[PDB]
Amino acid sequence: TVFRQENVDDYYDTGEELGSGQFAVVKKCREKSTGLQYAAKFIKKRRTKSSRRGVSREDIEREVSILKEIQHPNVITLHEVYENKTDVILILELVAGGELFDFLAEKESLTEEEATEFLKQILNGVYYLHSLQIAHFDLKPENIMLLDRNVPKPRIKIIDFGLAHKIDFGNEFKNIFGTPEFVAPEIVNYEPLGLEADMWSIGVITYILLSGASPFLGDTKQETLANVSAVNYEFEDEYFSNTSALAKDFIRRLLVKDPKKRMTIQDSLQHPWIKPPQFE
Ligand SMILES: Nc1ncnc2c1ncn2[C@@H]1O[C@H](COP(=O)(O)OP(=O)(O)NP(=O)(O)O)[C@@H](O)[C@H]1O
């Protein structure tokens, strides 16, 4: 699939840099013809077939294909895609309230209500994605953006579909690997992966939202991964002494090693609490 090859600079003006990754950089931008603002994600292309630098065409096209199919309040949308010799430039919906990661860093820890307000939106977005058999595979605070953080109940959108895959055969087997602190045991063990992996990540995010602490984080990546595979975590009283037993129950049913025994996204929405790379 080829994309628009005219110079993006002839149609957009860029500004502040929103995020910087290993093979991608995101900058705020404005479309000249409408005055509307977006987030331009510049993904570096591979210069040869056998290169570690850059992202393969296959991987870029997968992210674009998935983004083109989604339209939901809690997920980022794709506006246009350009490309040149060195990059594929995705013009994405702008989320200017910053990362949930930075929001949590400035506030330390939330109340269960504040935590559930964020979680419910994440669950709604994931429910949409999983309904389309799309596994995100990289869910974490850094990949959740707020529309406006200067409001008591910030609205959010899930971003970064660089590892997202269509799961049409129930599972994918291709060494997909996200951030150690949030990956499920099956990722750590290089086993077939499915929508269940995202549910584990949601459990980790929930633990963090409520305590301000990471459940499996070790001093090294290998330690973290070892902790994940052994489901080595506990609810420290210093952090959870005033957290409800139901909230812990919700987390406990997500941080389950056997993917088949883990709550599904539908289960999470009906749960009593809710119901109204790897080397370094
Ligand atoms: N739509 C958006 N609106 C605002 N900020 C965004 C948006 N998309 C991404 N960002 C920011 O840019 C950062 C990096 O974007 P991301 O999509 O995660 O790239 P990446 O997948 O890490 N790229 P790469 O390093 O090439 O694998 C994020 O963590 C956000 O802070």
What does the alpha-carbon distance between residue 232 and residue 223 come to, in Å, rounded to a whole number? 10
Whole-number Cα distances in Å, 241 to 87, 211, 237: 50, 10, 5
Distance 182 CA to ligand 1 centre (A): 17
- Residue 29 tokens, joined: 């931008």
Whole-number Cα distances in Å, 74 to 33, 80, 144, 179: 27, 19, 9, 22
95 is in an annotated binding site: yes
- Residue 233 tokens, joined: 């975590």
Task: Please confirm, yes or no, whether 258 is among the known catalytic residues.
Answer: no
Pairing between β-strand 78-83 and β-strand 87-93 as defined by DSSP bridges: antiparallel
Contact by Cβ (8 Å): 263, 251: no
Expt. technique: X-ray
What does the alpha-carbon distance between residue 35 and residue 184 come to, in Å, rounded to a whole number? 42
Q: Is the dihedral angle over the CA atoms 240, 246, 248, 251 positive or is it negative?
A: negative
Query: For the chain, what is the radius of gyration of the CA atoms?
Result: 19
Q: Name residue, tokens 């995705």.
A: 90
State the maximum Cα–Cα separation within the chain, in Å, rounded to a whole number.
58
Contact by Cβ (8 Å): 76, 159: yes
What does the alpha-carbon distance between residue 114 and residue 258 come to, in Å, rounded to a whole number? 30
CA dihedral 22, 183, 195, 201 (to 10 degrees): -100
Amino acid type, 108:
E
What does the alpha-carbon distance between residue 74 and residue 76 come to, in Å, rounded to a whole number? 7
Q: What is the DSSP string of the chain?
A: ---B-S-GGGTEEEEEEEEE-SSEEEEEEEETTT--EEEEEEEEBPSSTT-SSSB-HHHHHHHHHHHHH---TTB--EEEEEE-SSEEEEEEE---S-BHHHHHHHH----HHHHHHHHHHHHHHHHHHHHTTEE----SGGGEEES-SSSSS--EEE---TT-EE-SSS-B-S-----TTT--HHHHTT--B-THHHHHHHHHHHHHHHHSS-SS--SSHHHHHHHHHTT-----HHHHTTS-HHHHHHHHTTS-SSGGGS--HHHHHHSTTT------
What does the alpha-carbon distance between residue 52 and residue 22 come to, in Å, rounded to a whole number? 11
Check pocket membership of 181 for ligand 1, CB cut-off 6 A: no
Distance 248 CA to ligand 1 centre (A): 31
Whole-number Cα distances in Å, 13 to 30, 32, 33, 35, 40: 5, 7, 11, 10, 10
Nearest by Cα to 187 from 206, 165, 209, 208: 165
Contact by Cβ (8 Å): 250, 240: no
Q: Which of ligand 1's atoms lies nearest the C-alpha of 142?
A: 29
In order of start, what are the domains of the chain with their CATH numbers?
14-104 (3.30.200.20), 105-277 (1.10.510.10)
- DSSP lists the bridge partners of residue 19 as 26
What does the alpha-carbon distance between residue 165 and residue 62 come to, in Å, rounded to a whole number? 7
Distance 260 CA to ligand 1 centre (A): 31
Contact by Cβ (8 Å): 146, 98: yes
